[PDB]
Amino acid sequence: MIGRILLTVVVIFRILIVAIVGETVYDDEQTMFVCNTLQPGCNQACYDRAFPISHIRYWVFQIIMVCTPSLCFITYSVHQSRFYIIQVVFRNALEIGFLVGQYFLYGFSVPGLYECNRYPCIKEVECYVSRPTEKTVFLVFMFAVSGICVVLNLAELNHL
Amino acid sequence: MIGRILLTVVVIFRILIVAIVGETVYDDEQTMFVCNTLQPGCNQACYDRAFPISHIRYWVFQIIMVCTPSLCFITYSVHQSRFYIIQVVFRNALEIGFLVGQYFLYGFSVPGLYECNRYPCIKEVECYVSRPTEKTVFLVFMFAVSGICVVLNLAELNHL
Amino acid sequence: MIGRILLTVVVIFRILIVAIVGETVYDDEQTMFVCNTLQPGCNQACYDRAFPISHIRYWVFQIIMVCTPSLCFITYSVHQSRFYIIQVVFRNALEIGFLVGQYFLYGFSVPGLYECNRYPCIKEVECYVSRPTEKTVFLVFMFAVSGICVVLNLAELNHL
Amino acid sequence: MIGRILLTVVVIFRILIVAIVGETVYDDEQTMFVCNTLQPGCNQACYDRAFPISHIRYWVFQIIMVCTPSLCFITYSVHQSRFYIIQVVFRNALEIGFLVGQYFLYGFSVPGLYECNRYPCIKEVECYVSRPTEKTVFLVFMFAVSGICVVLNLAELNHL
Amino acid sequence: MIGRILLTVVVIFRILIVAIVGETVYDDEQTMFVCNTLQPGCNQACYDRAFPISHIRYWVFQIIMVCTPSLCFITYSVHQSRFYIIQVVFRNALEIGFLVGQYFLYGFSVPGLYECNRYPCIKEVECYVSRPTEKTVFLVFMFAVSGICVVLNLAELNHL
Amino acid sequence: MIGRILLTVVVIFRILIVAIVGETVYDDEQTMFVCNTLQPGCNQACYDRAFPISHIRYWVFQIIMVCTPSLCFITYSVHQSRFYIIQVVFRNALEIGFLVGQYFLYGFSVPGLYECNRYPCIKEVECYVSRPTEKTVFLVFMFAVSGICVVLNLAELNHL
Amino acid sequence: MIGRILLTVVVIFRILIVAIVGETVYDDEQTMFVCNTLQPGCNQACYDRAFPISHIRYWVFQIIMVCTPSLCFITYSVHQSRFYIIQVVFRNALEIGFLVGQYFLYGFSVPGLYECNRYPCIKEVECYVSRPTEKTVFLVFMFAVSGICVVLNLAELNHL
Amino acid sequence: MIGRILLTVVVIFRILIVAIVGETVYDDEQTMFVCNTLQPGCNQACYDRAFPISHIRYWVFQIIMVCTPSLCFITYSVHQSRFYIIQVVFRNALEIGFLVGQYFLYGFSVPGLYECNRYPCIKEVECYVSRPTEKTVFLVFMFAVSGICVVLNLAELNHL
Amino acid sequence: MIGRILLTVVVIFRILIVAIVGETVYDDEQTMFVCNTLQPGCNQACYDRAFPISHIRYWVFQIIMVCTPSLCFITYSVHQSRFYIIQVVFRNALEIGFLVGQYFLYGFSVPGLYECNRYPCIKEVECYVSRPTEKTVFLVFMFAVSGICVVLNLAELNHL
Amino acid sequence: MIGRILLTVVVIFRILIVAIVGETVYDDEQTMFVCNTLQPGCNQACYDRAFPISHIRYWVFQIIMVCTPSLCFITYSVHQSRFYIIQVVFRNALEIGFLVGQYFLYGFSVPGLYECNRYPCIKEVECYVSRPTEKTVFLVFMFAVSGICVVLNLAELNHL
Amino acid sequence: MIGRILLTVVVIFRILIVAIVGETVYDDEQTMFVCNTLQPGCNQACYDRAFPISHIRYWVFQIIMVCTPSLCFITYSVHQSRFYIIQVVFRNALEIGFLVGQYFLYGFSVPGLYECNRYPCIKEVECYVSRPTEKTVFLVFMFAVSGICVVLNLAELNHL
Amino acid sequence: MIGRILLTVVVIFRILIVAIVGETVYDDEQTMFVCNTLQPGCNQACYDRAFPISHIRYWVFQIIMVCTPSLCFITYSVHQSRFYIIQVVFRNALEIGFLVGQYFLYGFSVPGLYECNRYPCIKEVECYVSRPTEKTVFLVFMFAVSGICVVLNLAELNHL
Ligand SMILES: CCCCC/C=C\C/C=C\C/C=C\C/C=C\CCCC(=O)O
Ligand SMILES: CCCCC/C=C\C/C=C\C/C=C\C/C=C\CCCC(=O)O
Ligand SMILES: CCCCC/C=C\C/C=C\C/C=C\C/C=C\CCCC(=O)O
Ligand SMILES: CCCCC/C=C\C/C=C\C/C=C\C/C=C\CCCC(=O)O
Ligand SMILES: CCCCC/C=C\C/C=C\C/C=C\C/C=C\CCCC(=O)O
């Protein structure tokens, strides 16, 4: 009983946190990225190698993707127990996959230094990241929230 | 039955994905485009030759264009089975044409280097693109979604 | 019968296209305009001579102006066949005048080079435009939409 | 009868024109203002002397000020012919005063050159304005609209 | 009777004026502040000494603070003559205090020059302000509006 | 009785103050941060060491976190005295913890100078902060509001 | 009799004037030559077109060339009236030819402005010369001295 | 008797002073000449107008010119009282003319500021001279030496 | 008889011309060499490829080398007809070899443009030379003098 | 007896020291003089105020001036005991005057900082000198040598 | 017999070649040395590591050192066969040692690229040399001359 | 006997080495001295603290000073065994004192890094020296030569 309330509260909290404040930490991600070199075009290559995909893009995609089964169920109901089981299983699988993917993609920390050896950069150069601590805190917070969501989903699945 | 629900869900998902996050990857498309030269006016010419039309503009136009028949049908109903068949055929043709056009215009990847030989640039110069990986991922995702939409439309057409 | 539906659909489509995407192509119109000279104040004069009025301003003004008769009719009705005829004639005249004015003002293409001979620029200098292809495509699209609107208005006028 | 409808249409048209497009022509008023000198602080002084108050600020203030009597009448009615006469007289006086003030403040054209002789600028220097033609067109359009409004108000006043 | 209507109109007018146009004059307050020196860090110190708190921040705080008693009364009524007297007294005191505080903080004019003698600036340097005339006009207008509000509040207090 | 009204008023006042004006003081936090050195990458490291987390982020997180129990209670009621006691205790604990955390994290003032000795900066360098006075005022105001909230919560807890 | 003394004095005076002070006016001929353009390589082309050969080089060559017959006569005498006549004729011819060549090459004045239309310069540009007045004075002085020398040589030739 | 010794000593002293130290004060005459403007080509024009001919050039020419009669007399003697008288008269005339010419050309002081109104400089600008005091001292010293020389020459002329 | 005198005069003339004026045309050979690129190190490589050895170095070496046999003969005489013949043959061979080498190394003209395709320069770039006309004139003059010397040496060789 | 030898040795030593090494310490006197300001023309004024006359110029003038009586005596002897006495007195007076003048002009040390308050510099600025220690050592050494010379001259004067 | 003449000629030729032209190739050795980095102080360290001692310094030292025995012999003779033998042996040893030292120090070629990994340079950077070809030619020429000198010295030693 | 010859040879060798090549290593001593900071005036102070007196100045002074007794003896002889002894003692003392002074002033090596903590430099900064290896080699060579000179002087002193 309380599990559903907690799940809804956690989902809304995650959505609000991502929407309100997330899109400002990464505003100047590339403008403040500097490398120690004179070669034109090294900054772009090194930034693209360091950060292939931004964290906020991944989190937005995950948020939108993990809420499709509810829309499908609502649409079916409007047009109108098996659907419940199928959607619960799909939600659990989606959440677990997204959590594992985040872990394998980003890790647990954002270092303040990067070593870049991509053309046109000559040999290996050093580049400096902007705001590592805030991004590390964001990473840890999102991981914790996703873990709580996964735990609640598994508990609900095992209830039936 | 389920086909209509899936089609609506896919359409709404595509619209949301394009609207929320698409208009930020391409924000600094031209500000971070750099060429290796001293000649004034080479950057503008080379950028215009590399990217005649931005991806987001094309996707917005496609999204708006593929939803006209529904508006026409709604307007006719408000003023008030042949119309259904005609609009289904028109939608299928529009989707197929837009998919083929996207493929012929952009391809499947965005390279990180460009070779530019347009006046006033002297002989051939080299220019460097910003964020190739994110744009490649966006291209592949949009192509997949459009393919799914085309498949569903063809299935619905063949149902009757 | 279908003519009214098509006219409304075209009007709404034009309004949406102008509103959503139009105000971003011209965002950096003057920041990326460069001339080959060292004289202060030549860039401003040459930009003002090349582009006295931006396209988006003209299109917004046209959109707002071509929808006044409907507001007048609605206001008269709220306060409450001759008015219908008068407003149809006024709309036709406004649309034709705006189309001819656009043609005489801008033409059909935006060249990538400009020759500037305005004070304080010494003799004749060369300046380079930003994004000619997108603006040419926009010009052609708007001209086509306006032509379709004019054709439909003339057909409706000749119906009675 | 038609006079009231025309007055309302003109007021709404003016408000929409000012709101939608006005706040973008003057966005870079000071960033693109350049003077021919090396002295620090001459640009700020010369810009402040050339343009003490921006046009858009004046127009917004005028728009907000010329619509107070209607609010007063509505509030009195909610709390609940002399009030009608008093508010008509007040509106006429406000409109005439604002028109005369605009004429005495700005004139009919915005020149492309300015001569500046304010400290710390040494002797007389020359400064260059950005977008004179668009601002001149805006000035003329606003003057015409205000004149039409004044004419309609005087006609309504003389009706009774 | 008319006093309440005038007070409400003045309050709404002040709120609208502050909200719509106020937040654009001060947009580039610090970017266009220049001092005549080569020492790093002198600009920040001199700007902070010249303008400890921006005018718009103070005005927003005053606007929000002078409308608390109404919210308290509304909340008490929803939960449900002494409260009326207490809230009137509180409003009068708040308005008078804010007016006196504004006068003691800012004055009546914004000079175009500042003399700065704060570390790390060596001896005394000169700095140049941006847009003094507009800010002076804003100061005078806000002072006049606040004075009118205080007069009306005192009249209402003395009525009973 | 009055305690609930005061608590609600204080909460709404805090939310409005944070939302409307807070997100503009810290807009240029990193762009105007300057250090006295020539070494690339020293600015980023020194800024990250001086300000690990921005104040506005912390305040937004606190505001969102201190209002979860109300949402939980509302959800339980919609699904439908112990819950009241539990949520009151949780709110008190959350507020006290957040206040103590703010005190231990930030303190009571923002100095205008910082001493930085982080790699790649050689030995110890000096960096200069932007807008210390406004941020100090914000710190003190937020601390006072939070203290008032804690006092009211403790009073309500002791009432029962 | 006096003619020989005057000729020797004039020759020595010319040599001393050229040697001592001539090689310093033209020291910064190319470093202070500036053109109004941004195109790389325009300065070199325009300087080479304006001044194919420096004046001092021509004068040094003339000085060395007009004194060969004396060396030939001295060498013949050391090895040891016809030779006298032949060398006088040769000297007269050399002096006349050099004077006419100087006139046809340089003229009588050095203007302070030049119009340059050589690749890579686009269309026609303007360039600014350094020290026109000193070079004009030098030109006139050298022409006068050469004329006096020619007159004396012709007088000596006609004596016999 | 002593007059000849004093004249020879003064001549040798003047020659040595001019030769050894004179050619270093004016080494950076044009490199350190700065004008307050942004217009290319204003520095060259203003420097040429301020200093048409350098002082050292004039002094070298005067030194070389005032010693020709001695060379003529020596040459005549080698080839071998009227010549004595003629050369004395010529020397006196040359010295007086050169002194008057120096006075009319340069004056008695070198100011530290110049007002320049020559094309391409717009209106009147201000330029700053390098080393005024040393050049003033040099001017006065040379004038005094030349005056002493003239006095001695006149005394010798009047002796016979 | 006259041949020896002419040969000595030509040799001395060549030596004087090379010594006095040659070492100033090439003073700024590398400082004024500019290439159209942003790549560091392209200027050095392109200059070294365009001008492996300077003309003046070659001419100085040739001048010193073509006068060794005279020194050898003088030394032998001091220590003290076959030697005469041997040294004449050696001189003729040296002069012919140096002339042919100059022709094969440099040619007859110095172009004003160079095409450079050496690492690190990307593809082919364009570089601009300084003072082509003076260097071409010098080349032609030196070639003519060397040819005259060779002709005289051959005539003397054939005399015996 | 030994006094004459010591005087000659000291004079030659002073001349050699001044000639060989003196003219290199002051080579970059003005190029390395920097002031903390942005105002054009402040560097020239402040340098001219700090160093009206260079030390080396004064020392060269003194060296040349203190050796005139010997030249006068030599000239009189060539043309050919009172002259001896007169020249000794003149030399003593010249040396004493030059020593006192040096002391009153320069002092005993060259500080590394200067405070400048001359137009166009605003208020008082700070400027930094180049090579204070070497110049101080030179000052002390020259003062000591001049003192020794004065002592020897006085001893010789008192001998007779 | 001829060996002594050849040795003297070679020595004088080497001295002249080194003196006249050698001191101009290396004039801009360090000014045109560029490295691809932004770190201050990397250029100095990398230049010092690449070229510890300049070639011209070594050659001058060798030239001066290999001619001491002749001075010693001349001094002994002036003061006035064993000395002959001793000085010949010393000269041979000195020449052989200097040749071997040159070979071990410099080699046979000067590359156009250098790899630098000295503090403060981060990891390994690339630097570009100026005029490699001329310096290689100089190296080879000096080596050949020194070898010829060594051969002649050994022949003379073996003669006795 | 041989000792005098060796002493003269060493003295002449030292003089030649110092004169010919010494004055070029230190030509750019201050132009290539760089410190890691942004503060104006830190470079001058740090250079003056690192190198109070240049090595070449000290060596020139020592060379000139150690040869005074010979001049005194020559002058006494021209005017014309105790003098011999006195001058030998004076020379020995001068040489020993100069050697010890050099050791105490400079040491044995020139490091490539310097730590500077002089006003206006903030705290301690790092500066980079130019050409440490050449200067170290020069130091060692001069020390060795001076030691040899001292040894020879002591041997000569002990001979008698
Ligand atoms: C300064 C505050 C303004 C923030 C503006 C930023 C973004 C727009 C708002 C939300 C987008 C962010 C995250 C995902 C939110 C909603 C997805 C809809 C899900 C659904 O419907 O199933
Ligand atoms: C210029 C004014 C515009 C400001 C835009 C900025 C931010 C968007 C608005 C609010 C976010 C700021 C603070 C927290 C507010 C609400 C949290 C929701 C709490 C709940 O629902 O429990
Ligand atoms: C600052 C003064 C130093 C000036 C140095 C400049 C040049 C060197 C001197 C002279 C060269 C100039 C002009 C021609 C002079 C002599 C030619 C020799 C003629 C002959 O022998 O038949
Ligand atoms: C401004 C004029 C000063 C020029 C100074 C330049 C160079 C020094 C002089 C001459 C060197 C140039 C060319 C070759 C001359 C002589 C070689 C000696 C031949 C021999 O002895 O067999
Ligand atoms: C442009 C030409 C001027 C060149 C000036 C350069 C240097 C000065 C001259 C010579 C120094 C160079 C090399 C060695 C020469 C002589 C050493 C003396 C040997 C001895 O006496 O035993």
mmCIF file of N, CA and C and ligand atoms in Angstrom, chain A residues 14-24 56 59-61 63-68 70-71, chain B residues 12 16 20-21, chain F residues 23, ligand 1:
data_model
loop_
_atom_site.group_PDB
_atom_site.id
_atom_site.type_symbol
_atom_site.label_atom_id
_atom_site.label_comp_id
_atom_site.label_asym_id
_atom_site.label_seq_id
_atom_site.Cartn_x
_atom_site.Cartn_y
_atom_site.Cartn_z
ATOM 1 N N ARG A 14 12.198 12.935 -8.562
ATOM 2 C CA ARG A 14 13.257 12.824 -9.557
ATOM 3 C C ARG A 14 12.975 13.727 -10.751
ATOM 4 N N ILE A 15 11.732 13.721 -11.234
ATOM 5 C CA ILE A 15 11.387 14.539 -12.396
ATOM 6 C C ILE A 15 11.603 16.014 -12.083
ATOM 7 N N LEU A 16 11.127 16.462 -10.917
ATOM 8 C CA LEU A 16 11.278 17.868 -10.552
ATOM 9 C C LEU A 16 12.746 18.251 -10.417
ATOM 10 N N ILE A 17 13.539 17.407 -9.755
ATOM 11 C CA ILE A 17 14.952 17.716 -9.561
ATOM 12 C C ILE A 17 15.656 17.830 -10.905
ATOM 13 N N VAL A 18 15.389 16.894 -11.817
ATOM 14 C CA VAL A 18 16.030 16.950 -13.126
ATOM 15 C C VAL A 18 15.590 18.196 -13.887
ATOM 16 N N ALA A 19 14.294 18.517 -13.845
ATOM 17 C CA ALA A 19 13.775 19.597 -14.677
ATOM 18 C C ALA A 19 14.239 20.967 -14.194
ATOM 19 N N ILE A 20 14.120 21.241 -12.898
ATOM 20 C CA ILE A 20 14.298 22.607 -12.410
ATOM 21 C C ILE A 20 15.757 23.044 -12.445
ATOM 22 N N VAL A 21 16.670 22.231 -11.915
ATOM 23 C CA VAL A 21 18.026 22.681 -11.650
ATOM 24 C C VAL A 21 19.066 22.002 -12.538
ATOM 25 N N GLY A 22 18.746 20.858 -13.141
ATOM 26 C CA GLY A 22 19.741 20.109 -13.891
ATOM 27 C C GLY A 22 20.290 20.828 -15.106
ATOM 28 N N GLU A 23 19.467 21.622 -15.789
ATOM 29 C CA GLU A 23 19.818 22.190 -17.083
ATOM 30 C C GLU A 23 20.644 23.471 -16.966
ATOM 31 N N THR A 24 21.208 23.754 -15.793
ATOM 32 C CA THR A 24 22.052 24.929 -15.605
ATOM 33 C C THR A 24 23.489 24.600 -15.233
ATOM 34 N N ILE A 56 22.860 15.071 -18.748
ATOM 35 C CA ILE A 56 21.480 15.539 -18.699
ATOM 36 C C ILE A 56 20.666 14.940 -19.840
ATOM 37 N N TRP A 59 19.782 11.414 -18.804
ATOM 38 C CA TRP A 59 18.771 11.378 -17.753
ATOM 39 C C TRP A 59 17.393 11.746 -18.291
ATOM 40 N N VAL A 60 17.321 12.729 -19.190
ATOM 41 C CA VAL A 60 16.037 13.098 -19.782
ATOM 42 C C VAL A 60 15.476 11.934 -20.589
ATOM 43 N N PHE A 61 16.331 11.288 -21.387
ATOM 44 C CA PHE A 61 15.873 10.150 -22.176
ATOM 45 C C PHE A 61 15.365 9.035 -21.273
ATOM 46 N N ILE A 63 14.163 9.305 -18.203
ATOM 47 C CA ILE A 63 12.915 9.718 -17.568
ATOM 48 C C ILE A 63 11.750 9.538 -18.529
ATOM 49 N N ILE A 64 11.923 9.955 -19.784
ATOM 50 C CA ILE A 64 10.826 9.843 -20.741
ATOM 51 C C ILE A 64 10.549 8.379 -21.069
ATOM 52 N N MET A 65 11.599 7.556 -21.157
ATOM 53 C CA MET A 65 11.419 6.170 -21.578
ATOM 54 C C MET A 65 10.767 5.322 -20.494
ATOM 55 N N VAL A 66 11.064 5.587 -19.216
ATOM 56 C CA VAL A 66 10.548 4.734 -18.145
ATOM 57 C C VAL A 66 9.084 4.988 -17.822
ATOM 58 N N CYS A 67 8.403 5.859 -18.567
ATOM 59 C CA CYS A 67 7.004 6.176 -18.310
ATOM 60 C C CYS A 67 6.102 5.909 -19.512
ATOM 61 N N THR A 68 6.524 5.054 -20.441
ATOM 62 C CA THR A 68 5.713 4.729 -21.610
ATOM 63 C C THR A 68 4.603 3.734 -21.275
ATOM 64 N N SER A 70 2.755 3.305 -18.707
ATOM 65 C CA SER A 70 1.591 3.964 -18.125
ATOM 66 C C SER A 70 0.748 4.633 -19.201
ATOM 67 N N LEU A 71 1.399 5.303 -20.156
ATOM 68 C CA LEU A 71 0.662 5.925 -21.250
ATOM 69 C C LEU A 71 -0.065 4.881 -22.086
ATOM 70 N N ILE B 12 3.734 10.665 -30.051
ATOM 71 C CA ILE B 12 3.898 11.567 -28.915
ATOM 72 C C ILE B 12 5.327 11.509 -28.388
ATOM 73 N N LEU B 16 7.828 14.727 -28.178
ATOM 74 C CA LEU B 16 8.424 15.153 -26.915
ATOM 75 C C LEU B 16 9.945 15.149 -26.991
ATOM 76 N N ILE B 20 11.847 18.744 -26.328
ATOM 77 C CA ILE B 20 12.471 19.044 -25.040
ATOM 78 C C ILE B 20 13.980 19.214 -25.160
ATOM 79 N N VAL B 21 14.670 18.277 -25.812
ATOM 80 C CA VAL B 21 16.119 18.205 -25.732
ATOM 81 C C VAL B 21 16.806 18.531 -27.055
ATOM 82 N N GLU F 23 17.932 33.390 -8.978
ATOM 83 C CA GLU F 23 18.628 32.764 -10.095
ATOM 84 C C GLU F 23 19.296 33.776 -11.024
HETATM 85 C C1 LIG M 1 14.069 27.138 -14.732
HETATM 86 C C2 LIG M 1 12.957 26.099 -14.768
HETATM 87 C C3 LIG M 1 12.489 25.785 -16.183
HETATM 88 C C4 LIG M 1 12.939 24.416 -16.674
HETATM 89 C C5 LIG M 1 12.663 24.196 -18.162
HETATM 90 C C6 LIG M 1 13.239 22.906 -18.657
HETATM 91 C C7 LIG M 1 12.611 21.884 -19.236
HETATM 92 C C8 LIG M 1 11.148 21.756 -19.558
HETATM 93 C C9 LIG M 1 10.464 20.872 -18.556
HETATM 94 C C10 LIG M 1 10.634 19.562 -18.383
HETATM 95 C C11 LIG M 1 11.549 18.647 -19.147
HETATM 96 C C12 LIG M 1 12.504 17.956 -18.216
HETATM 97 C C13 LIG M 1 12.447 16.699 -17.781
HETATM 98 C C14 LIG M 1 11.414 15.655 -18.102
HETATM 99 C C15 LIG M 1 10.029 16.165 -17.820
HETATM 100 C C16 LIG M 1 8.885 15.742 -18.355
HETATM 101 C C17 LIG M 1 8.689 14.657 -19.366
HETATM 102 C C18 LIG M 1 7.213 14.359 -19.648
HETATM 103 C C19 LIG M 1 6.831 12.935 -19.285
HETATM 104 C C20 LIG M 1 5.398 12.511 -19.655
HETATM 105 O O1 LIG M 1 4.585 13.407 -19.954
HETATM 106 O O2 LIG M 1 5.170 11.283 -19.625
#
